[PDB]
């Protein structure tokens, strides 16, 4: 996987245009060991072809490493969603991707 950074800016009532997927904090995230093939707990299940994230170059399969400066490699699903939500209309993400 290769790292990239995307800065997403949206309007109040739209989304950023992706579905996030990964393990909830009730799984033993304390035991998660990143590997090259599975480098972070949360990844992109889909990216809306009409949306902000698509235009920033994000694609299905990208693994989420950082949200607004906070590393999320070993962070549970609902907690990562909360970190994204708290940024409002701007999201600075770092991901690792097959391309």
């Amino acid at each position: 996987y290769f790292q990239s950074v995307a800065i997403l800016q949206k309007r109040d009532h739209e989304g950023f245009g992706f579905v996030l997927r990964g393990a909830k904090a009730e799984t033993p995230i304390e035991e998660f060991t990143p590997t090259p093939a599975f480098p972070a707990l949360q990844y992109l299940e889909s990216v809306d072809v009409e949306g902000v994230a698509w235009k920033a170059g994000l694609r299905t399969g990208d693994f989420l490493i950082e949200v607004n400066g906070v590393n999320v490699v070993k962070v549970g699903h609902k907690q990562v969603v909360g970190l994204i939500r708290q940024g409002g209309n701007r999201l600075v993400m770092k991901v690792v991707s097959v391309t």
Binding site: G15, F16, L20, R21, G22, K24, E45, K78, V81
Partner: peptide, 6 residues
């Protein structure tokens, strides 16, 4: 494993 639209 959970999924959420963002």
């Amino acid at each position: 494993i959970e999924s959420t639209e963002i």
